[PDB]
């Protein structure tokens, strides 16, 4: 069960930075 | 829940990519 | 964040000092006195 | 100490025995000195490359470990795979964990490719690689909870292990429900979806008492009409009956008319006559009609303050369309009967909406309707309206009405009556794909009468709904870039949109061919075709195709149909959508802003998300008039059947709708949203809700079509009534026998209170002596001196429960009669009748 | 005593700091940003001190206290305070929070503080048992944030072993533990582990073993300044020994530039020690402003007499210094490098002659460098020319070492290339600044 959970725990880091990124791009836009 | 978390996360990543692509376009088009 | 890993292991002269100053050589007047005397004779 | 790496000198030697002690030793010390052995590589590699070494299978392990330490995973599995037994089987160490992770990570990539090209061209899969994964598959099976390996099972195809996992000990068949839900929701390949479904059905059949409810629901997506027909017959021959009824009653509430028409046909080849009677939809409308008529309660006071607040503008059509919602499927036309002179204050086209409004009010009336329509409205517009009105009553279920409609459409003034006629016939035989109807609809379209086209186009699309008819799509478009009369295109734009409903990959050419055509109307039809062809499955490819046009394209109309079209494809997951458009909805051209509201509305069918709402909150103040108009409609669309307790803005907007309508200096367009919004909030007397998603997770073809053509009200007011299709009575019928309607008393779980049915100068100071008199006057004054609440609502079989409360419903365990189909999902359910002395028959 | 009363006030403030750390630690876990922890970990060295036995006990009696075996592990390993009058129950976890197992971040952080206290209390074994268990705890723990808190503990754990003075028992452990990070794309943990590992390698002089590890391994570019400074020194030490001098100066000077302005009096002391010796072997007289600085004044004074020797070229003076100050060099780990110089003093004077003279006749070079014969200089003159310490051509037809005719660089392509490396970094800085910009998810 370990690999199936480590894999989700690295894709979680990538989506996390994407979400912080999408917020910024929304900010650069609305201005 | 090992599988369940997996598909929601990967779906989120795939969908957040679309938001990036659209926002990247709209920033460009707005600049026009 | 002191690097305690690397142990942190009179001449209170203010002026910044250049390498050439340390050079040990006889005073200038003695050089010229010799140089002038040598070519003088 | 082990502070050196000269062993690689041993592997430099030639004695085969001496290599083995070196190779063994490195694998005993590779975990630390991965550096030097990295430069060796070839030395260790050649040992395995050489087929004569005595312990080659040990060479790869050490070499593989060196590469795993170095980090070239692309080569680590290669050597790991080459070895065996000791290679990775140990399944104990971290290096094993990292190699296995990739190996099962590598496996899926090949298998996904393989399932793409299975016609012999499929690339080979190494047995050791399959060996390790299946060994893992055999590992994941026998280790611990199988609800995990199943996910990895379907992660890398491998249907055999999928069947093995669920069919194995599996604790209980509950994990079958878990797998089924995952197959429907988080599966993005239809071809796999079919293959997963076949496994889910096959497991269903072999069960001792197969779950008929799920199996028929499973089959519907699998598109197996004949298979369900044989299931129905055996259930009848086995004397099951009681379970057979729900399978039919659940079937009609999800499937398509073509599916039913085929499934009914198989049966024809006593009780079966009952089965046919209930699959065709006779019963559902009648019970759904009996519900709404028996449980109707529409606050006519709300309309009155809107009728008297109308400034005689074009908002007379709004009130005529507003009430249609407030009485959709209720037959309570008291308002139109009551206020009669005012009804006649609208003439020309609005007369066509009013005549149509009568049809929606008698929604689901059936046999009485044919005379019913002729009685009230027996005028080119009015007659055209009645014929269109007749279709609404028999919407999706014409049956016999189609033949009369076909005959009546042919004999017409070749004017408005033809316009209403085609729309009525198209609506009546919606999805029938009937050739006879289609040929006549074409002739009217080829008539090229402008107003005729706008209805023939939609009628052409609806009749061919989801048919992919190559002739229809080629023919429909061929008219588009060959006709003037923009109006005819407006119908054709949606008309060819619905022809591709739900294929979801099947054409994908009209989506690309149309999006490139210069004619902006066709482009919109291309964008809509993305909505109707990708409804539900939020394909990230399409959503990127569609947001693009809404940001770059120039013709603003296509831009709107771009942003708005998102909702149809994201409606299965209302969570993502309130975020995607949250920034679209402030775009510099107000058209794109409009698409945001309608996108938010269609997106969130009936949920009081309060996240979509808050986005529409600032919009409702938008300077543009049409951006405001859509905002209220989008808000009203999502806020249907929700009390202030359910969503804390519902009561806030209601007075905003009242304020906008009762205002005098707002543009009529904002009001049209206001009037329409009023009808949406109380549609069906607070007894219907709009939800494109079916009860069992399906895409509701009647409901989704309803909204799409409704959104095309900007181009035609009389299309407005098409939202009547999106009203699904939020009801649970306690049908026990075929016709018995017992007065079942069942209870809900309204926790802290009840909800649902909502609603029915200055004193001047004069400080000189004011206080002295008042302080002396007071002195003169002194001288003068739910726990048992509803949620146990004793409601007849027609009990209105909104979608959020279908779960908090408490089983009628107290009542002598309890339901045999699980009574937690609204709709029509079979009451499991207890011991004899059956009574409490209801049939008003 | 009021000193301890301020101490417990320091404890509570450290507890509040810890509670700030734990609340931020618990913040990052649910805050979806590992960045938060870095602030708590930077206060770690600051809060690392200022703690006695009462601190952890109340912290561990304030934190944890879930009745978990955790209390049973570190409470015995630290002296417990008496029934103190100011029993401020500092429990950021109340009931359910106590019932909920401590997140792997805070537990290690608290355990590290015990570990730090263990170091602060010289209890490297109780910390050893604490720490390896910490690792034995965090070895299984696979979160994304714990990698940071794990990284700090690692060096302390390497540091607890560092005071344990074995460094081979952790040679393997830190060697494998590193590989756990790299298979995780983790940023900080890989950085911290490598530096501690390398320190292990140089400490026993396995430069060959070390030179490999840097060869295959890649140091995360987006690494902590503190770490980036460290790795550059160790690589500089390795490169200098490997006879790649010119690169040794570039990294060491760059390593020095990254020193934490004024916190690490030591690191700047040692690097300058190698830089001065490294520079001498390459033929460059080091900067004088070094030897006068306050912190490095007496520390580098031993090297001072050397650099004066090389410029003077008085070999007798050079040997005299090694005889006296030489022994001290060994402890600094530089004696060997100085030994290289003793038979390399001729190079600089060959550079001094090539920097000023432009056509010096060989016989003259012999006179001004003390070379025994005009023939001997030729090999040395060419060799310095051969080794790229000069830019001259020896025309043996008439025995004159011509220097290269320098050109107008601004008309050649050198300035453009120097501007490119500059502009690429300047543009990259803009992207890195803009790329993060950390617009908080609009609240």
mmCIF file of N, CA, C and O in Angstrom, chain D residues 529-578:
data_model
loop_
_atom_site.group_PDB
_atom_site.id
_atom_site.type_symbol
_atom_site.label_atom_id
_atom_site.label_comp_id
_atom_site.label_asym_id
_atom_site.label_seq_id
_atom_site.Cartn_x
_atom_site.Cartn_y
_atom_site.Cartn_z
ATOM 1 N N UNK D 529 -22.127 22.410 -29.741
ATOM 2 C CA UNK D 529 -21.931 20.991 -29.997
ATOM 3 C C UNK D 529 -20.889 20.407 -29.055
ATOM 4 O O UNK D 529 -20.896 19.202 -28.781
ATOM 5 N N UNK D 530 -19.985 21.243 -28.545
ATOM 6 C CA UNK D 530 -19.101 20.795 -27.475
ATOM 7 C C UNK D 530 -19.902 20.537 -26.208
ATOM 8 O O UNK D 530 -19.619 19.597 -25.455
ATOM 9 N N UNK D 531 -20.917 21.362 -25.952
ATOM 10 C CA UNK D 531 -21.713 21.201 -24.741
ATOM 11 C C UNK D 531 -22.593 19.962 -24.817
ATOM 12 O O UNK D 531 -22.591 19.131 -23.903
ATOM 13 N N UNK D 532 -23.356 19.822 -25.900
ATOM 14 C CA UNK D 532 -24.252 18.680 -26.018
ATOM 15 C C UNK D 532 -23.498 17.384 -26.273
ATOM 16 O O UNK D 532 -23.987 16.307 -25.921
ATOM 17 N N UNK D 533 -22.322 17.456 -26.889
ATOM 18 C CA UNK D 533 -21.579 16.241 -27.181
ATOM 19 C C UNK D 533 -20.662 15.817 -26.048
ATOM 20 O O UNK D 533 -20.146 14.696 -26.081
ATOM 21 N N UNK D 534 -20.453 16.667 -25.050
ATOM 22 C CA UNK D 534 -19.586 16.346 -23.924
ATOM 23 C C UNK D 534 -20.283 16.630 -22.601
ATOM 24 O O UNK D 534 -19.630 16.964 -21.610
ATOM 25 N N UNK D 535 -21.604 16.500 -22.570
ATOM 26 C CA UNK D 535 -22.339 16.794 -21.353
ATOM 27 C C UNK D 535 -21.879 15.872 -20.237
ATOM 28 O O UNK D 535 -21.674 14.673 -20.443
ATOM 29 N N UNK D 536 -21.702 16.441 -19.053
ATOM 30 C CA UNK D 536 -21.300 15.663 -17.901
ATOM 31 C C UNK D 536 -19.806 15.456 -17.773
ATOM 32 O O UNK D 536 -19.160 16.102 -16.946
ATOM 33 N N UNK D 537 -19.238 14.574 -18.589
ATOM 34 C CA UNK D 537 -17.843 14.206 -18.389
ATOM 35 C C UNK D 537 -16.939 15.405 -18.622
ATOM 36 O O UNK D 537 -16.637 15.752 -19.767
ATOM 37 N N UNK D 538 -16.463 16.016 -17.546
ATOM 38 C CA UNK D 538 -15.737 17.257 -17.672
ATOM 39 C C UNK D 538 -14.403 17.081 -18.358
ATOM 40 O O UNK D 538 -13.358 17.394 -17.782
ATOM 41 N N UNK D 539 -14.425 16.574 -19.588
ATOM 42 C CA UNK D 539 -13.201 16.340 -20.339
ATOM 43 C C UNK D 539 -12.319 17.577 -20.302
ATOM 44 O O UNK D 539 -12.707 18.639 -20.792
ATOM 45 N N UNK D 540 -11.130 17.451 -19.715
ATOM 46 C CA UNK D 540 -10.244 18.600 -19.609
ATOM 47 C C UNK D 540 -9.768 19.064 -20.974
ATOM 48 O O UNK D 540 -9.402 20.233 -21.136
ATOM 49 N N UNK D 541 -9.762 18.176 -21.964
ATOM 50 C CA UNK D 541 -9.423 18.590 -23.320
ATOM 51 C C UNK D 541 -10.459 19.565 -23.864
ATOM 52 O O UNK D 541 -10.113 20.638 -24.371
ATOM 53 N N UNK D 542 -11.741 19.207 -23.765
ATOM 54 C CA UNK D 542 -12.792 20.080 -24.278
ATOM 55 C C UNK D 542 -12.823 21.409 -23.537
ATOM 56 O O UNK D 542 -12.837 22.474 -24.163
ATOM 57 N N UNK D 543 -12.819 21.369 -22.205
ATOM 58 C CA UNK D 543 -12.891 22.603 -21.431
ATOM 59 C C UNK D 543 -11.762 23.542 -21.823
ATOM 60 O O UNK D 543 -11.897 24.768 -21.733
ATOM 61 N N UNK D 544 -10.628 22.990 -22.254
ATOM 62 C CA UNK D 544 -9.570 23.842 -22.782
ATOM 63 C C UNK D 544 -9.895 24.306 -24.193
ATOM 64 O O UNK D 544 -9.524 25.416 -24.587
ATOM 65 N N UNK D 545 -10.581 23.471 -24.973
ATOM 66 C CA UNK D 545 -10.992 23.900 -26.304
ATOM 67 C C UNK D 545 -12.000 25.028 -26.226
ATOM 68 O O UNK D 545 -12.055 25.893 -27.106
ATOM 69 N N UNK D 546 -12.815 25.032 -25.179
ATOM 70 C CA UNK D 546 -13.967 25.920 -25.152
ATOM 71 C C UNK D 546 -13.651 27.235 -24.456
ATOM 72 O O UNK D 546 -14.106 28.293 -24.905
ATOM 73 N N UNK D 547 -12.878 27.194 -23.371
ATOM 74 C CA UNK D 547 -12.431 28.428 -22.742
ATOM 75 C C UNK D 547 -11.578 29.242 -23.699
ATOM 76 O O UNK D 547 -11.597 30.476 -23.665
ATOM 77 N N UNK D 548 -10.808 28.566 -24.551
ATOM 78 C CA UNK D 548 -10.005 29.277 -25.537
ATOM 79 C C UNK D 548 -10.846 30.249 -26.354
ATOM 80 O O UNK D 548 -10.504 31.431 -26.470
ATOM 81 N N UNK D 549 -11.949 29.772 -26.931
ATOM 82 C CA UNK D 549 -12.745 30.619 -27.812
ATOM 83 C C UNK D 549 -13.337 31.781 -27.033
ATOM 84 O O UNK D 549 -13.580 32.862 -27.578
ATOM 85 N N UNK D 550 -13.575 31.576 -25.740
ATOM 86 C CA UNK D 550 -14.184 32.616 -24.923
ATOM 87 C C UNK D 550 -13.175 33.676 -24.514
ATOM 88 O O UNK D 550 -13.539 34.659 -23.861
ATOM 89 N N UNK D 551 -11.904 33.490 -24.860
ATOM 90 C CA UNK D 551 -10.909 34.490 -24.502
ATOM 91 C C UNK D 551 -10.297 35.133 -25.738
ATOM 92 O O UNK D 551 -9.854 36.284 -25.685
ATOM 93 N N UNK D 552 -10.266 34.427 -26.863
ATOM 94 C CA UNK D 552 -9.572 34.900 -28.052
ATOM 95 C C UNK D 552 -10.517 35.311 -29.172
ATOM 96 O O UNK D 552 -10.311 36.355 -29.798
ATOM 97 N N UNK D 553 -11.543 34.509 -29.449
ATOM 98 C CA UNK D 553 -12.430 34.796 -30.565
ATOM 99 C C UNK D 553 -12.999 36.202 -30.452
ATOM 100 O O UNK D 553 -13.052 36.789 -29.368
ATOM 101 N N UNK D 554 -13.432 36.742 -31.587
ATOM 102 C CA UNK D 554 -13.822 38.146 -31.656
ATOM 103 C C UNK D 554 -15.338 38.320 -31.657
ATOM 104 O O UNK D 554 -15.866 39.147 -30.911
ATOM 105 N N UNK D 555 -16.069 37.566 -32.479
ATOM 106 C CA UNK D 555 -17.515 37.739 -32.531
ATOM 107 C C UNK D 555 -18.114 37.421 -31.168
ATOM 108 O O UNK D 555 -18.190 36.255 -30.771
ATOM 109 N N UNK D 556 -18.568 38.459 -30.465
ATOM 110 C CA UNK D 556 -18.888 38.316 -29.051
ATOM 111 C C UNK D 556 -19.917 37.228 -28.800
ATOM 112 O O UNK D 556 -19.884 36.579 -27.750
ATOM 113 N N UNK D 557 -20.835 37.008 -29.736
ATOM 114 C CA UNK D 557 -21.860 35.998 -29.511
ATOM 115 C C UNK D 557 -21.237 34.627 -29.311
ATOM 116 O O UNK D 557 -21.661 33.866 -28.433
ATOM 117 N N UNK D 558 -20.228 34.292 -30.113
ATOM 118 C CA UNK D 558 -19.551 33.015 -29.927
ATOM 119 C C UNK D 558 -18.852 32.985 -28.580
ATOM 120 O O UNK D 558 -18.762 31.936 -27.934
ATOM 121 N N UNK D 559 -18.339 34.130 -28.136
ATOM 122 C CA UNK D 559 -17.662 34.176 -26.849
ATOM 123 C C UNK D 559 -18.606 33.773 -25.733
ATOM 124 O O UNK D 559 -18.244 32.985 -24.853
ATOM 125 N N UNK D 560 -19.825 34.305 -25.753
ATOM 126 C CA UNK D 560 -20.812 33.940 -24.749
ATOM 127 C C UNK D 560 -21.113 32.451 -24.795
ATOM 128 O O UNK D 560 -21.088 31.766 -23.766
ATOM 129 N N UNK D 561 -21.397 31.926 -25.987
ATOM 130 C CA UNK D 561 -21.683 30.503 -26.103
ATOM 131 C C UNK D 561 -20.454 29.682 -25.764
ATOM 132 O O UNK D 561 -20.538 28.462 -25.593
ATOM 133 N N UNK D 562 -19.296 30.332 -25.683
ATOM 134 C CA UNK D 562 -18.110 29.654 -25.185
ATOM 135 C C UNK D 562 -18.152 29.522 -23.670
ATOM 136 O O UNK D 562 -18.153 28.409 -23.134
ATOM 137 N N UNK D 563 -18.206 30.645 -22.960
ATOM 138 C CA UNK D 563 -18.171 30.591 -21.505
ATOM 139 C C UNK D 563 -19.395 29.868 -20.962
ATOM 140 O O UNK D 563 -19.292 29.067 -20.027
ATOM 141 N N UNK D 564 -20.569 30.131 -21.533
ATOM 142 C CA UNK D 564 -21.781 29.478 -21.049
ATOM 143 C C UNK D 564 -21.714 27.972 -21.253
ATOM 144 O O UNK D 564 -22.145 27.201 -20.389
ATOM 145 N N UNK D 565 -21.184 27.533 -22.392
ATOM 146 C CA UNK D 565 -21.142 26.113 -22.712
ATOM 147 C C UNK D 565 -20.323 25.302 -21.721
ATOM 148 O O UNK D 565 -20.473 24.078 -21.682
ATOM 149 N N UNK D 566 -19.461 25.940 -20.930
ATOM 150 C CA UNK D 566 -18.726 25.198 -19.916
ATOM 151 C C UNK D 566 -19.669 24.403 -19.030
ATOM 152 O O UNK D 566 -19.434 23.219 -18.763
ATOM 153 N N UNK D 567 -20.748 25.033 -18.576
ATOM 154 C CA UNK D 567 -21.550 24.437 -17.523
ATOM 155 C C UNK D 567 -22.045 23.051 -17.876
ATOM 156 O O UNK D 567 -22.025 22.143 -17.042
ATOM 157 N N UNK D 568 -22.497 22.867 -19.112
ATOM 158 C CA UNK D 568 -22.990 21.562 -19.519
ATOM 159 C C UNK D 568 -21.954 20.467 -19.320
ATOM 160 O O UNK D 568 -22.326 19.329 -19.013
ATOM 161 N N UNK D 569 -20.667 20.775 -19.483
ATOM 162 C CA UNK D 569 -19.640 19.742 -19.479
ATOM 163 C C UNK D 569 -19.057 19.586 -18.084
ATOM 164 O O UNK D 569 -18.423 18.572 -17.777
ATOM 165 N N UNK D 570 -19.265 20.582 -17.232
ATOM 166 C CA UNK D 570 -18.799 20.527 -15.856
ATOM 167 C C UNK D 570 -19.931 20.310 -14.863
ATOM 168 O O UNK D 570 -19.720 20.459 -13.655
ATOM 169 N N UNK D 571 -21.125 19.958 -15.334
ATOM 170 C CA UNK D 571 -22.279 19.944 -14.446
ATOM 171 C C UNK D 571 -22.269 18.727 -13.535
ATOM 172 O O UNK D 571 -22.943 18.717 -12.500
ATOM 173 N N UNK D 572 -21.523 17.686 -13.900
ATOM 174 C CA UNK D 572 -21.446 16.515 -13.036
ATOM 175 C C UNK D 572 -20.605 16.769 -11.797
ATOM 176 O O UNK D 572 -20.746 16.043 -10.808
ATOM 177 N N UNK D 573 -19.734 17.773 -11.824
ATOM 178 C CA UNK D 573 -18.894 18.128 -10.683
ATOM 179 C C UNK D 573 -19.044 19.616 -10.407
ATOM 180 O O UNK D 573 -18.185 20.426 -10.773
ATOM 181 N N UNK D 574 -20.134 20.010 -9.755
ATOM 182 C CA UNK D 574 -20.364 21.439 -9.498
ATOM 183 C C UNK D 574 -19.309 22.100 -8.634
ATOM 184 O O UNK D 574 -19.405 23.309 -8.404
ATOM 185 N N UNK D 575 -18.325 21.360 -8.121
ATOM 186 C CA UNK D 575 -17.330 21.975 -7.244
ATOM 187 C C UNK D 575 -16.289 22.752 -8.042
ATOM 188 O O UNK D 575 -16.003 23.912 -7.736
ATOM 189 N N UNK D 576 -15.712 22.127 -9.071
ATOM 190 C CA UNK D 576 -14.684 22.793 -9.861
ATOM 191 C C UNK D 576 -15.219 24.059 -10.511
ATOM 192 O O UNK D 576 -14.549 25.100 -10.520
ATOM 193 N N UNK D 577 -16.422 23.979 -11.063
ATOM 194 C CA UNK D 577 -16.950 25.035 -11.922
ATOM 195 C C UNK D 577 -17.069 26.404 -11.267
ATOM 196 O O UNK D 577 -16.752 27.402 -11.935
ATOM 197 N N UNK D 578 -17.534 26.546 -10.023
ATOM 198 C CA UNK D 578 -17.590 27.894 -9.434
ATOM 199 C C UNK D 578 -16.225 28.542 -9.313
ATOM 200 O O UNK D 578 -16.129 29.711 -8.926
#
